[PDB]
Design a binder for this molecule. Structure first.
Ligand SMILES: O=C1NCCc2c1[nH]c1c(Cl)ccc(Cl)c21
Ligand SMILES: [Mg+2]
Ligand SMILES: [Zn+2]
Length: 313
């Protein structure tokens, strides 16, 4: 009850900032996560014994892949924490509870491969879930871990609050399917500009929480350049492995994913920043003005990728 988590002074200050890096000490990540829940939600939101049992089961079900790993899970949860803290009054108790947990669980049991590689491989998961293949699996894994004895962190909620929170988590996890992001952002763009966007409209909330999930999921492009550059390495290690496996299926991969065409990465990064990241953080800042530091940092990093192409580094 009276057991606060505290952080060292540097972490205590820096964790409030969008561009915080959770650092290389794995064993500190669970406490960083609990710290964020206790300040986003309250020291009352979860039975600490259950939360901790939940966190360690979630951690175990992330695999040892270069990018889609436990560190990504906590990095994306930290970004959602920063958005929630900078937008205190815009979200319900249930939404704050649900979204931090959604972020932690959003890539559960990721194998390092796209929905697209699953479909071409003819993976069992692609027969069970025709679209948002991995994202329907990640939600499935979340529910499975919630149903382990001692793991139902939501136990104290009413029957209908419970159904509300699991529906907040399903929509939020599904929304991390980047194929759904494009339409979701275009719809949010029109709604903001025609002035129809209404946060009391549940279907409008859903859209806005989806964009937040995309913004947190991509938050690697909003870090200080040295963090962004080294995380890009990790994402490309997965992309190249997947490119290799495409070749093994007798399919030339897009040059982005082909490890023989590493020279083309920077232009690929430019495209991704221009087509995905900048529009994502632009639309998010229009709707949630205090999220502007994410846009600014993303623009700084776009500028850094332009220097990479030019050969200035
Ligand atoms: O720079 C990146 N950081 C993490 C996220 C990310 C980055 N580059 C990407 C490309 Cl080219 C495609 C799809 C994603 Cl999710 C990408
Ligand atoms: Mg994912
Ligand atoms: Zn992710």
């Amino acid at each position: 009850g009276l057991m606060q988590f505290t952080l060292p002074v540097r972490l205590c200050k820096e964790i409030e900032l969008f561009h915080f890096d959770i650092g290389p000490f794995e064993n500190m990540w669970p406490g960083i996560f609990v710290y964020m829940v206790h300040r986003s939600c309250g020291t009352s939101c979860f039975e600490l014994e259950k939360l901790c049992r939940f966190i360690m089961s979630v951690k175990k079900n992330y695999r040892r892949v270069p990018y889609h790993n436990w560190k990504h899970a906590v990095t994306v949860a930290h970004c959602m924490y920063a958005i929630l803290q900078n937008n205190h009054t815009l979200f319900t108790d249930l939404e704050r509870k649900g979204l931090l947990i959604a972020c932690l669980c959003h890539d559960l049991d990721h194998r390092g491969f796209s929905n697209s590689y699953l479909q071409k491989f003819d993976h069992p998961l692609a027969a069970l879930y025709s679209t948002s293949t991995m994202e329907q699996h990640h939600f499935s894994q979340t529910v499975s871990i919630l149903q382990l004895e001692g793991h139902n962190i939501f136990s104290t909620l009413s029957s209908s609050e419970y159904e509300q929170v699991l529906e907040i988590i399903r929509k939020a996890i599904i929304a991390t399917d980047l194929a759904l992001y494009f339409g979701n952002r275009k719809q949010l763009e029109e709604m903001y500009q025609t002035g129809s966007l209404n946060l009391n409209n549940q279907s409008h909330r859903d859209r806005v929480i989806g964009l937040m999930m995309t913004a947190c999921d991509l938050c690697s492009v909003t870090k200080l350049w040295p963090v962004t550059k080294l995380t890009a390495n990790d994402i490309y290690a997965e992309f190249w492995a997947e490119g290799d496996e495409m070749k093994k299926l007798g399919i030339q991969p897009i040059p982005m994913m082909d490890r023989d065409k590493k020279d083309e990465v920077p232009q690929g990064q430019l495209g991704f920043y221009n087509a995905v990241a900048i529009p994502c953080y632009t639309t998010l800042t229009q709707i949630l003005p205090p999220t502007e530091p994410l846009l600014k940092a993303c623009r700084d990093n776009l500028s850094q990728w332009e220097k990479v192409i030019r050969g200035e580094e």
